Design a protein around this ligand. Structure first.
Ligand SMILES: C=CCO[C@]1(C(=O)O)C[C@@H](O[C@]2(C(=O)O)C[C@@H](O[C@]3(C(=O)O)C[C@@H](O)[C@@H](O)[C@@H]([C@H](O)CO)O3)[C@@H](O)[C@@H]([C@H](O)CO)O2)[C@@H](O)[C@@H]([C@H](O)CO)O1
Ligand code: ZN
Ligand code: ZN
Lengths: 217, 214
């Protein structure tokens, strides 16, 4: 086999700065007959298929921004992105085609940006869920940076069945969002009145508090 | 325009077989090698195999990881590529992509399909419950709860609302997936203008439109 290895595993860069990542092969990929390196680079944006960027080590495919440049030869290859843009958030894969094909393990490129506070929204259980015997309360914490965030649920003022999920970084504004869902039985839901989502994020020493009261529904 | 479209993914039991298809158009199919590549959720791409072009006798090659167990074939009359998978195991759960490959000259995979998700599991198919999430800018949502297998698709107003949407990755809890989706719109536009989430679960052929009512 030919072993393909990429570095770094991951990194974050601010818009406008340069990105360098590398790809090593266990064997030279330089074909002696054609005098080309059989090494290609693919970009996979979140939720998308991979897209060809560079092939033969340094040939930039038509339609690919000028800021992407492939270089290297033999066993060592480099993808350089100058003036990185928010939309360049992706996992980048190199792939040899010298002997069958083999992909590297990828480099995950994240985008660094200015800290941003979450916009927090809370939602009570729908009547169509309650009819069924369950009660989910949902809290969205949207468009914040950096990714680290704390969420606490309080029920009648006391801290408490939680599903947390983070989006991939946003391709436009480089923020993260998170959804937190508390699920109770209808029977337990109806024993209490106040339901509160509290978000603590580095952007404030004050937690952002969103609440509803069951009597107000 | 070159088009590659995979089909055939879904839920299958351990030890079972499944055959994927990849319909193509927009290029001279027989001129090209075609590859299959897979990606387990959150992991790296893995090349699986290829079938050569007409000039090379349409012969096949395979990664050691699947040689002897997966078979690639092609219909040169209709420009369709196939992957037959046998004795499936949990490790085979992944998104499967077809990619256009070598033409005798260029070294590149020029084009890739959207991928088809295969889930190898003993669990039964369970359709989602879909619940509306109602309360300058206003944020609304849909909770898509308790389904299996992945995937689901969520759009808002049949795809006309796309900016200001966050669809959260599904999370598995006690053998069922749940996800949610939020949409943020101007407060002057709701409930004056309608907001509806459109949810599909192909495994159970579920189609739901949920109006967000004040
Ligand atoms: C009717 C079948 C003809 O194929 C051969 C033969 O053995 O008779 C094989 C030729 O094979 C190559 C070659 O230069 O060795 C390789 C072919 O590419 C692939 C492969 O199919 O394994 C795939 C490429 O991505 C790359 O990995 C290469 C390697 O770099 C090795 O070269 O392998 C392909 O490039 C063919 C080309 O279509 C020939 O036109 O060449 C070669 O011996 C040909 C001969 O030129 C007559 O057609 O016959
Ligand atoms: Zn209680
Ligand atoms: Zn052969």
């Amino acid at each position: 086999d030919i072993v393909m290895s990429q570095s770094p595993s991951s990194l974050a860069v601010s818009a406008g700065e340069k990105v360098t990542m590398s790809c090593k092969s266990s064997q030279s990929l330089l074909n002696s007959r054609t005098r080309k390196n059989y090494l290609a680079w693919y970009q996979q944006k979140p939720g998308q298929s991979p897209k060809l960027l560079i092939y033969w080590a340094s040939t930039r495919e038509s339609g690919v921004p000028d800021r992407f440049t492939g270089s290297g030869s033999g066993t060592d290859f480099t993808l350089t992105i100058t003036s990185v843009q928010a939309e360049d958030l992706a996992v980048y894969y190199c792939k040899q085609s010298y002997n069958l094909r083999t992909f590297g393990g990828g480099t995950k490129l994240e985008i660094k940006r200015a800290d941003a506070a979450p916009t927090v929204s809370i939602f009570p259980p729908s009547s169509e869920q309650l009819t069924s015997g369950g009660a989910s309360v949902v809290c969205f914490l949207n468009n914040f940076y950096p990714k680290d965030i704390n969420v606490k649920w309080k029920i009648d003022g006391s801290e408490r069945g939680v599903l947390n999920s983070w989006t991939d970084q946003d391709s436009k504004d480089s923020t993260y969002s998170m959804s937190s869902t508390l699920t109770l039985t209808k029977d337990e839901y109806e024993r209490h009145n106040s339901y509160t989502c509290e978000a603590t994020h580095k952007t404030s020493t004050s937690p952002i508090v969103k609440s509803f009261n069951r009597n107000e529904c | 325009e070159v088009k590659l479209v995979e089909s055939g993914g879904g839920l299958v039991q351990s030890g079972g077989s499944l055959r994927l298809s990849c319909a193509t158009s927009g290029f001279t199919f027989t001129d090209y090698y075609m590859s299959w590549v897979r990606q387990p959720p959150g992991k790296a791409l893995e090349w699986l195999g290829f079938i050569r072009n007409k000039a090379n006798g349409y012969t096949t090659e395979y990664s050691p990881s699947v040689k002897g167990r997966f078979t690639i074939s092609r219909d040169n009359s209709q420009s369709i590529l196939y992957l037959q998978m046998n004795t499936l195991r949990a490790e085979d759960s992944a998104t499967y992509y077809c990619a256009r490959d070598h033409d005798g000259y260029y070294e590149r995979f020029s084009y890739w399909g959207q991928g088809t998700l295969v889930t190898v599991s003993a669990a039964k198919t369970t359709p989602p419950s879909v619940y509306p999430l109602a309360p300058s800018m206003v944020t609304l949502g849909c909770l898509v709860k308790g389904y299996f297998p992945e995937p689901v698709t969520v759009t808002w107003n049949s795809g006309s609302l796309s900016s200001g949407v966050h669809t959260f990755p599904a999370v598995l809890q006690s053998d069922l997936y749940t996800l949610s989706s939020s949409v943020t719109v101007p407060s002057s536009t709701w409930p004056s203008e309608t907001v509806t989430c459109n949810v599909a679960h192909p495994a159970s052929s579920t189609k739901v439109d949920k109006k967000i009512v004040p």
